[PDB]
């Protein structure tokens, strides 16, 4: 169907892309393929796709969707990534309703782990939403869609007004120059709210009504929500970005430290405040006809070509 892939069910839709499910024909692995038709793209949108690809090449994390191969024809551009066979947070909330604070805490820890990692590599997501927080086979978070993401310099103001309206920070609606991480922290507050409530803090019939709600900053806090959880959300959803919690303050919040001691979370957050070759895989690739030194050169040069994908997929 497409190169070495057998395409099937559509699993996602973007403004200019269609994400279809696919199988690697040589590795038998299950992957996702973002399909983009370059013919319907302006030069501003063509740059935003190439920026997304470069940003994804920098992010290798257990809770971020992993890019495997980038293929580009005269009129098409395909991004082959890992497939999350468990679903997405939005579908999970539609099927089962609000999560218990214990279940929500585990997923929220996984989200902040991946968002903190991004901010360490100087990248802001700018499109965190329930429908973009996928779930693997074990129901573990894998953040997807870095189309609206951008590189930032700590202390710089960004000027791209983008994001999912129900999760977008007030500054974005107001068209103000903003601090990247502070915009992601607001989205995280909405994500935490919707995880424990099964509903949005700011909602409406139209985008105009939704905007008025977000700019008000007022939101109902349900009876079932703990005092510790309410404090965390109220300190993330703050109209003044300077008065919002930082990523480090979120990770050390009383609600976050609740329940059993989580040293695996501490190890992942400490890694963000700062590998060898699988010789068995390299031998198997040599048997398929693929050159040993050419595979190593593809791996070290971040080519994300046929040799990179077969190595990365085989290491699973």
């Amino acid at each position: 169907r497409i190169g070495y892939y057998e395409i099937d069910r559509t699993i996602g839709k973007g403004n200019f892309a269609v994400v279809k499910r696919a199988t690697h024909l040589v590795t038998k692995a299950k992957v996702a393929i973002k399909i983009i038709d370059k013919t319907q793209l302006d030069e501003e949108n063509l740059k935003k796709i190439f920026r997304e690809v470069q940003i994804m090449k920098m992010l290798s994390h257990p809770h971020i969707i992993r890019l495997y191969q980038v293929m580009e024809t005269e009129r098409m551009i395909y991004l082959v990534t890992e497939y999350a066979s468990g679903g997405e947070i939005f579908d999970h909330l539609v099927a089962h309703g609000r999560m218990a604070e214990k279940e929500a805490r585990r997923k929220f820890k996984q989200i902040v782990t991946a968002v903190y990692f991004c901010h360490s590599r100087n990248i802001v997501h700018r499109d965190l939403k329930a429908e973009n927080l996928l779930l693997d086979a074990n129901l573990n978070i894998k953040i997807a869609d870095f189309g609206f993401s951008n590189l930032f310099t700590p202390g710089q103001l960004l000027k791209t007004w983008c994001g999912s309206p129900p999760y977008a920070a007030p500054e974005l609606f107001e068209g103000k120059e903003y601090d990247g991480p502070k915009v992601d922290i607001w989205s995280l507050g909405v994500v935490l709210y919707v995880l424990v409530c099964g509903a949005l803090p700011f909602d409406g019939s139209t985008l105009q009504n939704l905007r008025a709600r977000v700019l008000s900053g007022k939101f109902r806090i349900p009876f079932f929500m703990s005092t510790e959880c309410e404090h965390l959300i109220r300190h993330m959803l703050v109209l003044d970005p300077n008065k919002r919690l930082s990523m480090e303050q979120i990770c050390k919040h009383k609600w976050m430290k609740l329940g059993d001691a989580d040293p695996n979370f501490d190890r992942l957050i400490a890694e963000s405040q700062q590998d060898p070759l699988n010789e068995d895989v390299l031998l198997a690739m040599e048997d398929m006809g693929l050159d040993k030194e050419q595979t190593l050169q593809s791996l070290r040069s971040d080519a994300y070509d046929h040799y990179s994908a077969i190595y990365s997929l085989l290491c699973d």
Partner: single-chain antibody
Amino acid sequence: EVQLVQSGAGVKKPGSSVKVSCKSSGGTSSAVSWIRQAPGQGVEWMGGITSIFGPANYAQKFQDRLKITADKATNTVYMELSGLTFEDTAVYYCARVGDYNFWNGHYRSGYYFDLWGRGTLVTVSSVLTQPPSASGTPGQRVTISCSGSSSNIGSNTVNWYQQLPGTAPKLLIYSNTQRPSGVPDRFSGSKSATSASLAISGLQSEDEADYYCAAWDDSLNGHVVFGGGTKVTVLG
């Protein structure tokens, strides 16, 4: 043709929780809302899908005790009301929002309930101003007023429902003046600033029923508000 099949009636002890189902049995993606009606009382919106933005939207009154879920695979929608009290004894209906297929984030829905389930009687055992009653002689014209505020009628379309005894409310007027298929031209709607009116011309004995006006209220995260219900009585 397409029908909403609800679960059977039940008795719950106070403090417990009840789960009601609603399965679509026809030519299928929908926007099911849950509406309850206490014995001899008016209809009340509890929650359901009302925007393209969130997984569910609940009425403030029910936010703390309602859970609304859906099984896409089987076309079944669920409702779970917890911490039941004697005040939760009511008939629970599931209703589909007509213009769901038109929702875009920019398109403003009318929030008219196209299809209603037959109702589920759950028993616990151990905003819009409408006149309580209206009357007229056959052949005459009866008009029901429905006043509200600028957040609801002032900003949205008004829909009217007719409820016959022992049956679920039925859409009578949608989008202020429109009539669904089957509704005669005798019934007509109107809306001016914050008030709506329903005119029943050439009144017949068959029109003796309760009439409810409804509109989307933009207060809070949005909710559908209902009138108290007008009991039209057709004289001799």
